[PDB]
Amino acid sequence: KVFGRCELAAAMKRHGLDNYRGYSLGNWVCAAKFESNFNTQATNRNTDGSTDYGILQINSRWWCNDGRTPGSRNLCNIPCSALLSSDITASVNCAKKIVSDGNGMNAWVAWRNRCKGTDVQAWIRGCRL
């Protein structure tokens, strides 16, 4: 499913992400936009053979099992396939563990490069929230 901006902001808010570990809603929406263009079915393979999945492009080396990443750790206890669903619950729950892992949102390269330090509040402007 391809989310609209306000629609995604509203789902992420409901799922407890606004200000989770100090990151305002706008940070999460911005990350999604640049990681996946708001498409839950986005997948991308990395050179190391791991794959990034879903709206938040969570990586198969540490976070989910895809059965093809030798020595993955499966930290979120979930098949990577679950991160592609139209329901973002599994994606959000895993993201909460990643952001809590010690580097905050810097775990998301597109956040660090394209969101961090920008006016992220622009991503939830106009939304009914």
Catalytic residues: 35, 52
Place of tokens 């995604």: 8
Residue listed under structure tokens 């020595």: 71
d(CA 120, CA 32): 12
Three-state secondary-structure class, residue 87: coil
Q: Burial of 45 by CB count in 10 Å (0-12 exposed, 13-18 middle, 19+ buried)? A: exposed
Q: Is 18 assigned a ligand-binding role in the annotation?
A: no
Residues placed in the known binding site for substrate: 101
